[PDB]
């Protein structure tokens, strides 16, 4: 008799095991290409490697398993919010406890749905979330006739341009609390037409989120709403002695790009929107200045050579050049004589279309390119440290 793997395998001949779709190996234990992560509970024994379509080399993720509490946030981050994010306050949101928060002020509001939106520490890169669950405690009453509403999502999830759902088995009962537990897993979303979530669009979400809110409102007119015990997993690079987050690839990323799901781009690379999954990394455009810069927006940072701008394609004030051209001596000193004009504390100069410097902020009284002579009804040679007085004053 041969023993098939309970995780890979749907079925035996007896002799012969009958592998699940992501699974190969005379026992069926083993991921195929592209795959990771066997499991008893996956229909297709591994998942398949995202890595936001820059690489199919990924294993489980060695960081291990820990939670963003409700309770380590100021209530005053907590917000209401319509699906669309165009209807939001604060006012009327209380905390009655540590990580309790209570909204019984719906007569102030339209009438339409309302969400509980949770704060920064719950959004941003998340892809870490997958496989965990996002844990809450919810209370709500209606007015005494406030009309039941229908299929109202208990959750959605907003990021990178993706909006996904998730609907309970059971809305809350009146005037008692229900816990929810809600898997990052692709079976448990849909889009808001009814079409269930795939794997690369729940990541793709999860990578950005922008906004991840809770239903707040139930029904049509509600009197009170109440918000408790939230626990949203993640996973850490430090032990923390929890589960490593097996769910959670951790690619092999090419050149420019890091995170577990080759999700961000890495130092001396910025996103290009070339328009498949998130985009793709490319280097930084700095003309020759700088080799870091902000990995979404390009944006270059510590630009040298005495250069500015987001591309450090400008000389800074107080120098001038061409700073495209790409040279560390792209941007000269100015070299303008005396006091600036507007009792000014630096001058200013620029590369005149002869390509020789003319100062720009000479005082009045100055002449010339370099601020180096003296204006008519004026006295002085700023070239020998003499100032410019007007005739007549002293001395």
């Known amino acids: 008799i041969v023993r098939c793997d309970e995780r890979g395998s749907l079925g035996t001949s007896g002799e012969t095991c009958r592998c699940k779709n992501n699974v190969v190996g005379r026992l069926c234990n083993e991921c195929s290409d592209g795959s990771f992560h066997l499991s008893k509970q996956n229909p297709d024994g591994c998942l398949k490697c995202f890595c936001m ?51 019984s002020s719906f007569h102030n509001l339209l009438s339409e749905p309302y969400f509980w939106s949770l704060p920064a520490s719950f959004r941003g890169d998340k892809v870490t979330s997958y496989g965990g669950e996002l844990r809450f405690t919810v209370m709500q009453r209606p007015r005494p006739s406030s009309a039941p509403l229908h299929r109202q999502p208990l959750v959605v999830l907003q990021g990178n341009n993706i909006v996904l759902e998730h609907h309970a088995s059971r809305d809350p009962s009146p005037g008692q609390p229900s816990n929810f537990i809600v898997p990052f897993q692709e079976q448990a979303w849909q889009r808001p037409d009814g079409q269930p979530a795939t794997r690369e669009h729940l990541l793709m979400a999860l990578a950005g989120i922008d906004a991840l809110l809770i239903q707040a409102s139930y029904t049509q007119q509600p009197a009170e709403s109440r918000l408790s015990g939230i626990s949203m997993d993640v996973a850490v690079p430090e032990n923390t002695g929890q589960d490593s987050a097996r769910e959670v690839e951790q690619c092999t990323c090419p050149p420019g790009y890091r995170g577990p799901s080759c999700q961000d781009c890495d130092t001396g690379y910025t996103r290009v929107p070339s328009g498949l999954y998130l985009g793709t990394c490319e280097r930084c455009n700095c003309h020759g200045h700088s080799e870091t810069c902000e990995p979404e927006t390009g944006a270059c940072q510590s630009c040298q050579h005495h250069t500015e701008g987001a591309s450090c394609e400008q000389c800074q004030p107080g120098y001038y050049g061409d700073a495209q051209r790409g040279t560390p001596q792209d941007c000269q000193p100015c070299p303008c004589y005396g006091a600036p004009a507007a009792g000014q504390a630096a001058h200013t100069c620029f590369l005149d279309t002869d390509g020789h410097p003319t100062c720009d902020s000479c005082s009045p009284g100055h002449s010339g390119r370099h601020c180096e002579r003296c204006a008519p009804g004026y006295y002085g040679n700023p070239s020998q440290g003499q100032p410019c007085h007007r005739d007549g004053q002293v001395p």
């Open 53 to 103: 379509g820059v690489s199919r080399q990924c294993s489980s993720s060695s960081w291990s398993r820990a939670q963003v509490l409700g309770a380590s946030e100021q209530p005053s981050q907590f917000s209401l919010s319509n699906a669309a994010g165009t209807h939001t306050t604060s006012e009327g949101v209380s905390s009655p406890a540590p990580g309790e928060l209570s909204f």
